[PDB]
Design a protein around this ligand. Structure first.
Ligand SMILES: O=C(/C=C/c1cc(C(=O)c2cccc(F)c2)c[nH]1)/C=C(/O)C(=O)O
Ligand code: NA
Length: 359
């Protein structure tokens, strides 16, 4: 059969046989994001995504025949890597002063594209020179980002993610004992590591007020217990009867919080001390019970899988999909789902397992 142009019609597992090509294409896509070239960024992301789905490594240009999303620019990059095992294009990006600075500065929690650009234009090149500067003013997010930098830059492993899951579940059930807590993001897709641990929380019997107060109760409990190192709660802007997003990259309107938690080493059951704890980035999302499948699907990712799911729904099925709902423009009805499988069925897609969504 023919490989689909949509990530939602491909099985993308963590055994990537084309890391030589995709690491180069991911660097080129990231540079186009920095250079504000959204179009070229998207073309490299789609090419990298399709190669990640292959069950074999590309070893000749003939191997690329019949593969979609491989334009002439991309094929030149693949050709170059086949030639000497390296990408001269990606090598130039890795040695570029702006690219190096952007990667380094945005590696700090609280620093995005605008602050990284600002510091570069000010002549900063190292985090040591930024942190020690007496004229710079930092946001509370950046202060936390610098204070817990070494812990946050070290990858969160599965024993740590599970230790955090235990803490989240223990805190949540204290206030809502019927609540369902699910680990989402990369770890749900089978990843060994991640930069953070994400969770979806839902309750079948909670009221609108109970739903709203849970993240405040849980974070106050952790603040009392001296485990809350950073906390930012974004209130819900969810609209029960609004049509799903038409945007390329849909925004999530559910109540959520961006945290840094103190994880004591005694809570981690691993193969393996220092201060005896590690700072961990944790995100919590609270959603209404009836929207739990849409939120789970959205938060499981990957970002490319989500983009293609929504693009397929729009272009192929005249349906509108987002983290909150699924709307059928032809039948003029919202479609209900109690599981991810039901969402895939509504869209006419064969079910793709979470570990097959690493697009
Ligand atoms: O990999 C991509 C990100 C989506 C995504 C969401 C997350 C987390 O936030 C996350 C991380 C670790 C643990 C955890 F529980 C949650 C992980 N995957 C996107 C590509 O497709 C690309 O950029 O090419
Ligand atoms: Na950052």
């Amino acid at each position: 059969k023919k490989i689909s142009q949509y990530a939602c019609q491909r099985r993308t597992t963590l055994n990537n046989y084309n890391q030589l090509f995709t690491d180069a294409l991911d660097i080129l896509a990231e540079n186009d994001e920095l250079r504000e070239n959204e179009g070229s960024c998207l073309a490299f992301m789609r090419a990298s995504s399709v190669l990640k789905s292959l069950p074999f490594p590309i070893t000749s240009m003939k191997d690329t025949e019949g593969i979609p999303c491989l334009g002439d620019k991309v094929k030149s990059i693949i050709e170059g890597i086949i030639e000497d095992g390296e990408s001269s294009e990606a090598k130039a990006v890795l040695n570029d002063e702006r690219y190096k600075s952007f990667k380094l500065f945005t590696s700090v929690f609280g620093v995005g594209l605008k602050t990284a650009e600002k510091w570069f234009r000010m002549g900063f090149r190292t985090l040591s020179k930024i942190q020690s500067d007496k004229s710079l003013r930092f946001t509370q997010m950046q202060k936390a980002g610098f204070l817990y930098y070494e812990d946050l830059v070290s990858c969160v492993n599965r024993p740590e993610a599970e230790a955090v899951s235990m803490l989240v579940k223990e805190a949540v059930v204290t206030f809502l004992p019927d609540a369902l807590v699910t680990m989402t993001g990369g770890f749900r897709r089978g990843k060994m590591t991640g930069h953070d641990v994400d969770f979806l929380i839902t309750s079948p019997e909670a009221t609108e007020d109970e739903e709203q107060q849970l993240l405040h109760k849980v974070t106050d409990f952790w603040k009392q217990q001296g485990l809350l190192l950073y906390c930012d709660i974004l209130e819900s802007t969810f609209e029960k009867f609004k049509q799903p997003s038409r945007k390329v990259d849909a925004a999530d309107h559910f109540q959520k919080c961006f945290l840094i938690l103190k994880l004591d080493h005694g809570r981690v059951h691993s193969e393996k001390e220092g201060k005896g704890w590690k700072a961990i980035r944790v995100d919590l999302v609270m959603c209404p019970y009836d929207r739990r499948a849409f939120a789970l699907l959205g938060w499981t990712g990957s970002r490319q899988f989500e983009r293609d799911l929504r693009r397929y729904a729009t272009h192929e099925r005249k349906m509108m999909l987002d983290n909150h709902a699924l709307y059928d423009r032809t039948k003029r009805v919202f479609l209900e789902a109690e599981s991810e499988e039901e969402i895939f069925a509504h869209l006419g897609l064969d079910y793709i397992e979470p570990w097959e969504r690493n697009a």
